[PDB]
Amino acid sequence: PFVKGFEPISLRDTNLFEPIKIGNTQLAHRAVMPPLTRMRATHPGNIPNKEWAAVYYGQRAQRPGTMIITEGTFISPQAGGYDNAPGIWSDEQVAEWKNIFLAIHDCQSFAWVQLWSLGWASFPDVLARDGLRYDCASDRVYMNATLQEKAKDANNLEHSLTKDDIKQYIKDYIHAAKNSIAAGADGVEIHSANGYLLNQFLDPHSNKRTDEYGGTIENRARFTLEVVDALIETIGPERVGLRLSPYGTFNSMSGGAEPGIIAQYSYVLGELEKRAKAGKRLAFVHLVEPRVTDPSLVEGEGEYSEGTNDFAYSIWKGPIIRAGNYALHPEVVREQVKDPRTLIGYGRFFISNPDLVYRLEEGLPLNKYDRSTFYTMSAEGYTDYPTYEEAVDLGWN
Ligand SMILES: Cc1cc2nc3c(=O)[nH]c(=O)nc-3n(C[C@H](O)[C@H](O)[C@H](O)COP(=O)(O)O)c2cc1C
Ligand SMILES: NC(=O)c1cccnc1
Helix, strand or coil, X not given: CECCCCCCCCCCCCHHHCCEEXXXXXXXXXXXXXXXXXCCCECCCCECCCCCHHHHHHHHCCCCCCEEEEEEEECCHHHCCCCCCCECCCHHHHHHHHHHHHHHHHCCCEEEEEEECCHHHCCHHHHHHCCCCEEECCCCCCCCHHHHHHHHHCCCCEEECCXXXXXXXXXXXXXXXXXXXXXXXXXXXXXXXXXCHHHHXXXXXXXXXXXXXXXXXXXXXXXXXXXXXXXXXXXXXXXXXXXXXXXXXXXXXXXXHCCCHHHHHHHHHHHXXXXXXXXXXXXXXXXXXXXXXXXXXXXXXCCCCXXXXXXXXXXXXXXXXXXXXXXXXXXHHHHHCCCCCEEEECCHHHHHCXXXXXXXXXXXXXXXCCHHHCCCCCCCCCCCCCCHHHHHHCCCC
């Protein structure tokens, strides 16, 4: 059904529907499909879904000139631990990704692979099954008591990364990025947000290291910036974006309660702008908003009201994608896209609205999403959400 009580506003007259160049791509509008884990990849081997994924992405690519960022995609076995999330390190994975990107490109839209590593958010027993470490910044701190107990029970305690482990992660990012581009992707997004591995190095709650990868702002940023530099060099800065969540508390990150947190993210952005002024500007920075500190909470819950991402605009001078509870708040979008280099990511309501862009353009009702099929191995709740005209036929109006 449609979302009850939602009063839609047409956004056709705004910068949301002005073209913009992002890296090598030419967008027709600024409504972005952000990375959304859906768990339809098959086991063993973390292989993209051969039946439904190309259809799902093709559906959401249907407006020409749409930017699509894929679900988090593991860069290597050691970076993973979720059986039904895809990877892009292997030939078998690449083979299906080719079909998925083909479906997106057939719509004259664009595909960016989000490159993912889990760190302490992984499942230590699943890793142990595969002979893999349970990786983190500092084994002195665990993400929560459940995982700590699981780690003990699996005889796979947290492993503080060594410098050599970090070098291997960088090699994995490079390999996964080369595979992404060879498979046909228009670019990659480095996931350094939402409490996964890179974010764990950025955050002073998870990172208690005293080597060159922790203990200062500069040190905590080093791993993320080494990944950024490795990908700039191998696939070009215009094929690389970076995702950050300054105010996130998901997966036990500090968020705004850490008064040093904006200096940490300011440093990262300044380092990116320094690179840009030297001729190597990333295609974009993707920020999760304090509107959503935790995406497991329903829209309107978990909103941090004591800080904003405004600081980023004074530092970084390229495109910024903003995500978090924007679908239900066109009035907020209307104000924020007045800035001419701002794009808007719509997550949960892109799940439920394959024709979201049209609905935004025309001010139409939105399909309610069904959380119970976010992660199920089904076409149901994946490819069977109706377009507006289809919903009207089913009587949803
Ligand atoms: C089911 C689900 C899966 C998600 N998967 C990813 C992911 O793989 N990588 C990522 O960076 N963010 C992921 N997110 C976070 C979203 O990209 C987005 O930041 C968040 O949902 C807030 O935007 P929204 O209110 O428009 O949904 C996911 C969110 C949901 C609800
Ligand atoms: N916010 C995220 O990065 C994320 C990733 C996978 C599942 N849920 C949330």
